[PDB]
Amino acid sequence: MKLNVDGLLVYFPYDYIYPEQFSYMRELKRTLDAKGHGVLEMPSGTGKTVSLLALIMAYQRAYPLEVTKLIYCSRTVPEIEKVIEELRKLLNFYEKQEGEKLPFLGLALSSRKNLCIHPEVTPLRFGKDVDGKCHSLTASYVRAQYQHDTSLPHCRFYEEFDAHGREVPLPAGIYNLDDLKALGRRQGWCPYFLARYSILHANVVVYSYHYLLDPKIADLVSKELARKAVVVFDEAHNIDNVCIDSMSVNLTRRTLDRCQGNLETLQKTVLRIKETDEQRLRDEYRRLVEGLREASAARETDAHLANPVLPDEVLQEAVPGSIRTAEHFLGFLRRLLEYVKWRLRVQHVVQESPPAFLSGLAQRVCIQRKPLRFCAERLRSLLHTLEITDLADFSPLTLLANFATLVSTYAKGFTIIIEPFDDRTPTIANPILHFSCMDASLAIKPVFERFQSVIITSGTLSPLDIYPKILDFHPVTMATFTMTLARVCLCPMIIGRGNDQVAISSKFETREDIAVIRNYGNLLLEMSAVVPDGIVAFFTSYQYMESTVASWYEQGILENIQRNKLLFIETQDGAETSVALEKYQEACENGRGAILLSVARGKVSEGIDFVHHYGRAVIMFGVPYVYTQSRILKARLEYLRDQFQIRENDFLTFDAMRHAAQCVGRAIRGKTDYGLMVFADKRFARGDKRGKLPRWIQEHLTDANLNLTVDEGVQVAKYFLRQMAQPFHREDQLGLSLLSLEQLESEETLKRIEQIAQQL
Amino acid sequence: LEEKNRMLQEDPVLFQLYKDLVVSQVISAEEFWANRLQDVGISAAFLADVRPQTDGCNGLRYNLTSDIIESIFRTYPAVKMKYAENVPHNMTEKEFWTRFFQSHYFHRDGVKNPLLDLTALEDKPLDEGYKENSNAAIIKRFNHHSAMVLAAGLRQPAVKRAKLQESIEYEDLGKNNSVKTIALNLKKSDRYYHGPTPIQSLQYATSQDIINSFQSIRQEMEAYTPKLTQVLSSSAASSTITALSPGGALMQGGTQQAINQMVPNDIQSELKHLYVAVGELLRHFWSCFPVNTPFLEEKVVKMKSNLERFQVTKLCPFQEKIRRQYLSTNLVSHIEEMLQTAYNKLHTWQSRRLMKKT
Numbered sequence A: 001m002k003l004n005v006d007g008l009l010v011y012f013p014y015d016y017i018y019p020e021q022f023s024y025m026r027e028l029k030r031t032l033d034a035k036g037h038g039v040l041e042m043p044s045g046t047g048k049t050v051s052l053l054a055l056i057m058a059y060q061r062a063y064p065l066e067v068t069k070l071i072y073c074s075r076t077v078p079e080i081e082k083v084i085e086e087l088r089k090l091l092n093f094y095e096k097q098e099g100e101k102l103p104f105l106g107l108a109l110s111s112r113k114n115l116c117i118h119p120e121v122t123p124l125r126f127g128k129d130v131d132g133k134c135h136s137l138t139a140s141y142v143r144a145q146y147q148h149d150t151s152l153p154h155c156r157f158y159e160e161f162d163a164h165g166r167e168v169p170l171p172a173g174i175y176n177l178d179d180l181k182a183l184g185r186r187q188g189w190c191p192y193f194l195a196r197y198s199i200l201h202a203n204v205v206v207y208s209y210h211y212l213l214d215p216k217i218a219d220l221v222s223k224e225l226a227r228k229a230v231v232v233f234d235e236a237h238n239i240d241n242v243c244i245d246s247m248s249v250n251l252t253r254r255t256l257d258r259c260q261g262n263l264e265t266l267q268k269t270v271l272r273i274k275e276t277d278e279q280r281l282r283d284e285y286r287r288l289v290e291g292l293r294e295a296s297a298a299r300e301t302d303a304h305l306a307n308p309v310l311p312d313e314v315l316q317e318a319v320p321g322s323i324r325t326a327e328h329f330l331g332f333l334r335r336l337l338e339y340v341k342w343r344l345r346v347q348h349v350v351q352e353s354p355p356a357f358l359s360g361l362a363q364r365v366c367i368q369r370k371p372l373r374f375c376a377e378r379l380r381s382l383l384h385t386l387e388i389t390d391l392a393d394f395s396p397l398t399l400l401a402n403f404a405t406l407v408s409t410y411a412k413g414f415t416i417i418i419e420p421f422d423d424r425t426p427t428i429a430n431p432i433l434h435f436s437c438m439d440a441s442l443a444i445k446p447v448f449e450r451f452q453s454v455i456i457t458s459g460t461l462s463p464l465d466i467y468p469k470i471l472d473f474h475p476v477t478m479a480t481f482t483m484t485l486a487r488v489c490l491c492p493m494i495i496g497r498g499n500d501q502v503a504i505s506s507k508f509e510t511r512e513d514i515a516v517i518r519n520y521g522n523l524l525l526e527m528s529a530v531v532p533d534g535i536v537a538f539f540t541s542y543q544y545m546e547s548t549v550a551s552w553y554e555q556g557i558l559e560n561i562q563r564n565k566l567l568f569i570e571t572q573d574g575a576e577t578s579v580a581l582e583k584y585q586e587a588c589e590n591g592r593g594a595i596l597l598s599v600a601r602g603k604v605s606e607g608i609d610f611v612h613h614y615g616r617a618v619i620m621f622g623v624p625y626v627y628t629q630s631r632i633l634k635a636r637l638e639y640l641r642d643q644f645q646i647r648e649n650d651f652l653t654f655d656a657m658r659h660a661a662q663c664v665g666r667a668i669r670g671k672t673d674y675g676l677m678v679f680a681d682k683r684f685a686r687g688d689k690r691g692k693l694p695r696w697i698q699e700h701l702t703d704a705n706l707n708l709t710v711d712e713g714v715q716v717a718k719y720f721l722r723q724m725a726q727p728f729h730r731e732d733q734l735g736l737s738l739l740s741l742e743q744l745e746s747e748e749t750l751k752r753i754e755q756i757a758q759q760l
Numbered sequence B: 001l002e003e004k005n006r007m008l009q010e011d012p013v014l015f016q017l018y019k020d021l022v023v024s025q026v027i028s029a030e031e032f033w034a035n036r037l038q039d040v041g042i043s044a045a046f047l048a049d050v051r052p053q054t055d056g057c058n059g060l061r062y063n064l065t066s067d068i069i070e071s072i073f074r075t076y077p078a079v080k081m082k083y084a085e086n087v088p089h090n091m092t093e094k095e096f097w098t099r100f101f102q103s104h105y106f107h108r109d110g111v112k113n114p115l116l117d118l119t120a121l122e123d124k125p126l127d128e129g130y131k132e133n134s135n136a137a138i139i140k141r142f143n144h145h146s147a148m149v150l151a152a153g154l155r156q157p158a159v160k161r162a163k164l165q166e167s168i169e170y171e172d173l174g175k176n177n178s179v180k181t182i183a184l185n186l187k188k189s190d191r192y193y194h195g196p197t198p199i200q201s202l203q204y205a206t207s208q209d210i211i212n213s214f215q216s217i218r219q220e221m222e223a224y225t226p227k228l229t230q231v232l233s234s235s236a237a238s239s240t241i242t243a244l245s246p247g248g249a250l251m252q253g254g255t256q257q258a259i260n261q262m263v264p265n266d267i268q269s270e271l272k273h274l275y276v277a278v279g280e281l282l283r284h285f286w287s288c289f290p291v292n293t294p295f296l297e298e299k300v301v302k303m304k305s306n307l308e309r310f311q312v313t314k315l316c317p318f319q320e321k322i323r324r325q326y327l328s329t330n331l332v333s334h335i336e337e338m339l340q341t342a343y344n345k346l347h348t349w350q351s352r353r354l355m356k357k358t
């Protein structure tokens, strides 16, 4: 289907388009006209990805110069696969419509774990082990030695790409990760290096946030990215959490022990190699004194231990001669590690700013800021110059060096928290140091200041002003697209009163209440006896969920629920949770009622999507407020209050509502997809809490369903299920919620579409 | 043989029929039985619902049933191993069940890649640098029991691509053909207007004299006056009464005879038995018919031989039994009609077969 969007032709691969999709296209085009960052809110299951891809392809076809390359940022690998499939379908439609294969190149980027074919590395269960094995088999210095001696360790997968894979770029088209692996097997090449080589040529490149947001991994992609590149963020409502996790550092006593052991091993190796060849140390000193640009720029294959965290200004400055010597730097690292371990001896939690810790270290160990600034450079150079293969055992040393480099240069927005005792079990000796970053905008600041425009979309975007404050920027367009439905597919209800009229709440003071647990059990039993097989229940914490399950078993209410429908409970084990999900889906598709129990912060709420027959019922047991005992969260709240005038309670409410919407928003995949939404808490009735719900969900939240009872909720569920289970025809959607070729051309419909979106 | 004897005992009339057909050498047991010749799913409530029946007089009624034990074995293969390793030597069954009740075992209180591989859902798996036991046990054993029940219910890039296609495809923006119908349009619709009704001698009237008669009656009834005396007369009334009188032409026939007393109930029951036997024999005969394979010819010949033997050995004694009482009912006439119809059918088919060959 061909569409006219403000004078730009759009090749829609499907026969019909939602009016909200047309509004999204028009607003996205307007954002592209300003070449600036923009935030848009689109309901999930509306095919916004198809519209975005179509508009980007139209922009590239009309003017390749304006959008030199498309950057897509996602959350999980299956999201990348789905985006690749959708873009492949769109490209096939383009080729059929135009009659020729367009010179379009699409590529999906992932880790070496998803792009290695070497048989020895395949059984490895961990990416870091995979990376270490690959580097041991693909070290630059080892490559020449293998050329001089075949029996020496090597990886022909990279060698053939170096010999043959560089010359001829891949043909225009779209390749999946499995497709890339198959092509690499066909050519005997490694798809990882080939994909990185072809990034400069690919029109569209898709990968995850950490591949670009993390400064440690920023240069692995940004080196082949120009100023006019356009980035896309999808379902990035937790982007601040990702940035904080990337910029946060954790240190433990076992980490210190491993660091000491690896440092002693490194010193022994240095002495041994000096005995074998002292000239290596002199050559390293020559490299340091003459400039760091020679070693880093001439070896692009050594990107295993790249640390682009430091700004470009720090790169020019050289390491002081006090630590240029390898042995001097080893002693410096030993002193730093001993000082850190002694500082960890405190028996209580200590909260400190980076400048104070740096001043204390300078007073004690006579360590200035400038020598510590270039710690990462010396670390990387020393690791490279010693032909170290099994770098996995040396990971704690690299982590400590990166932490020291962060402290030496990054001060504002960071907090050092020392907790010698576990929050859960203070009796257990767990001395843990946390270098926590409270400024996520620093991770996204280079993205804003380097790329032409940034596009962020998500289904849970209730506040449109907190994100410009959280990300510390001013988006060009802040538009929310309301959802228009000819048939109601969502039935949000709030039940703050149980059968015994108990005030239903999930406050940790009331989370241990037996009455709340029993009312939850009764609600779940009635829902299982009434609602169809697909039932998912999101709790507030793992311990609370386990205690509630135990209480239900003791009461016996859980037994009746098992009698009605099969139950599956997730644990902290990944394999057990995977088996539980598989069994849940199999039971739901086999006609036997299956109930899943998870947490709002668990993996289920992160990257699991529910189809119409899976997302029949989603029940949130109270507003998921994060357990405040983590002083990192408290410190972040204090920093936000002191830097953005944001109340800590308001931020907690926003985060809890965001998690709840993420848990609920994944149950609808289209107009014909209808599901049930239950919120079992009286606190949801609060205007501040209720007003923090997505517009497409909050609008449909009828006030008649506000603070219902268990039986009232059951009756409303019965009514909604019977209403929506009746057969429906897509023709009814024509002109009301679905637009054909002729209906979109109506000027009245265009005015209606313009009225649909709202800019704030 | 024992199973066949028990089944025959379950149907004594058939057993009597089997005797009258085999002992009289009418049909062989092989030919007799030539034409003569439940699993329960696994429920998850078989544990919570099933309780040791604690009758008030200190009665521990286990109500041990085979299906319950089979469900336990299917859901818990370990219980089957325990049963096979203990009884009948190490311990008794009831003691094993009692131990199971007292043990903590009773009183306990991914093929798809995209949306199952939770370990592989993240591309950044770095190190850890960047009544809880009772609850965990309860959750683990509940999940194990659910998986066991699901498994007992039953008793590659292509798969990933198929799963992705199923997940992404939208029913709205696809195809809605649904035209699995065949239209029908007959040639001549006038067949039904005069259907199975045979051709009637629907004679047409004469020439314009028909119009003259129509005009005559039109004028005759155009000036009409109602009459009362002319409507009926006593003589006409007497004739109508006589026609409606008992024994009249309208009163066809009259009283009949009590057939029930004309035949003994034993003779009636034997007639029912013979009716059922001949009916089943002829049903098998017609099932063989039409003879489309050479094997059917021998089977129908055997059927006719069996019919002849049964007739001679039963109806002829039955005919004599009826004739000794000199019953006026021709009950045997119906059987003779059926037998002769079948015999003539077979003879005619044999004649057709001979004609086709020649």
Ligand code: SF4
Pocket (backbone or CB within 6 Å): A112, A115, A116, A117, A118, A121, A133, A134, A135, A137, A138, A155, A157, A158, A190, A191, A192
């Ligand atoms: S070169 Fe490629 S195939 Fe070989 S170990 Fe490294 S990632 Fe794996």
